[PDB]
Design a protein around this ligand. Structure first.
Ligand SMILES: [Cl-]
Ligand SMILES: [Cl-]
Ligand SMILES: [Cl-]
Ligand SMILES: [Cl-]
Ligand SMILES: [Mg+2]
Ligand SMILES: [Mg+2]
Ligand SMILES: [Mg+2]
Ligand SMILES: [Mg+2]
Ligand SMILES: [Mg+2]
Ligand SMILES: [Mg+2]
Ligand SMILES: [Zn+2]
Ligand SMILES: [Zn+2]
Ligand SMILES: [Zn+2]
Ligand SMILES: [Zn+2]
Lengths: 163, 163, 163
């Protein structure tokens, strides 16, 4: 099965039980923030309310997909309120939009809006020209494995780099 | 009001009275050459004949626009006689042609014909690819403020960088 | 007269009599391998069988064109069996396919498949963007005269660089 959830499970990873992030709060699933901070009881309370069952604090893969899919909806909402990202997002097909959401989850919207020239080439359907330009970035140098997969997605509009 | 005259008033500047240029003759308006050289009476004579009124040597903004618009017509005529520039100029819309005329006023037609790769991308309607390539030039490094505005014009075909 | 034979006669050269190549066997025409190796009688035997007349070992220009045209057919067959090259080759017009065959004769299919980004831009009909990218290669630095002609062919789809 290949979709946005599986895409981020590969790029970011899955955590089926509560953990702490890099400075520094309680998290679950694919980067789902629960509370800030530092009592585990408050985070365990936020968990049960969010899923709608008994847990302390362990979930399933289907439950984690439910949390992640709500984050994507909130992310899409964010992108649509941003004048710098809305025209790109609008012009793209569903799979190329997943590559743009993947980037937003990694660096935030201010970071993604920084990819102006490449985002504009994508808008013009210059897939290959944008692929070449995206690979000449600091993002590509620092996380090349993730960046190569995201670039293939923007280039093809298929899930090929994740299969 | 936004047009080619206002565009060059911003990039090059307006002189409502006679002056001397960088080596070295009598000039008025947006770089309008009067005579070479060095008597101010000959230049003042050329002025009155060109406008069709009394002046020694001071003009209005509307009079300066008349002189400038004649230079653009002569510039367009020059571009059309050039095999290297005519195909680009022909393919462009009115606002993108103003960006190309702006470049010709800054560096001359031999200088602009030197932008071969970028001019060809413009011909293919590869706006964004040409914007990126134009920014990687010595012209961009030496006059970045003017170059950024001209590049936005080539990219959009709107007057946005001048409003 | 301008076609693929004349194109390679310019880029690689014509040999109307048997010779030895750079390590190291008997060759004729535009790089046509006869046998490996090292008896000239075996090569002279292979020659007569291939052309269908008396020779030891000297041919005409029309006979050399016959040998070369068989190599192009074998080259096209090779490209079509390659998943990395078949989609590009299919999308191109006859003259742009001749530029791609020229590259295959110079560096082989593994070498040409290495031009991924540029081949993809050609597929998208981004002629000018691919021309710029192809010129930024080691191939261009090592053989610029040949590379410039091949790049003009990919850019225009005309024989202009060879006329
Ligand atoms: Cl492209
Ligand atoms: Cl573009
Ligand atoms: Cl192009
Ligand atoms: Cl490009
Ligand atoms: Mg989506
Ligand atoms: Mg990585
Ligand atoms: Mg105009
Ligand atoms: Mg400046
Ligand atoms: Mg052919
Ligand atoms: Mg050479
Ligand atoms: Zn392109
Ligand atoms: Zn483009
Ligand atoms: Zn292009
Ligand atoms: Zn491009």
């Amino acid at each position: 099965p290949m979709n946005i959830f599986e895409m981020l499970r590969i790029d970011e990873g899955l955590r089926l039980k509560i953990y702490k992030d890099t400075e520094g709060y309680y998290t679950i699933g694919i980067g789902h923030l629960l509370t800030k901070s530092p009592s585990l009881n408050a985070a365990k309370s936020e968990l049960d309310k969010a899923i709608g069952r008994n847990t302390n604090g362990v979930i399933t893969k289907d439950e984690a997909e439910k949390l992640f899919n709500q984050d994507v909806d909130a992310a899409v909402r964010g992108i649509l309120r941003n004048a710098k990202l809305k025209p790109v997002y609008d012009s793209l097909d569903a799979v190329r939009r997943a590559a743009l959401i993947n980037m937003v989850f990694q660096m935030g919207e201010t970071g993604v809006a920084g990819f102006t020239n490449s985002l504009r080439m994508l808008q013009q359907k210059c897939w290959d020209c944008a692929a070449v330009n995206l690979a000449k970035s600091r993002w590509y140098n620092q996380t090349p494995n993730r960046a190569k997969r995201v670039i293939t997605t923007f280039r093809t509009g298929t899930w090929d780099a994740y299969k």
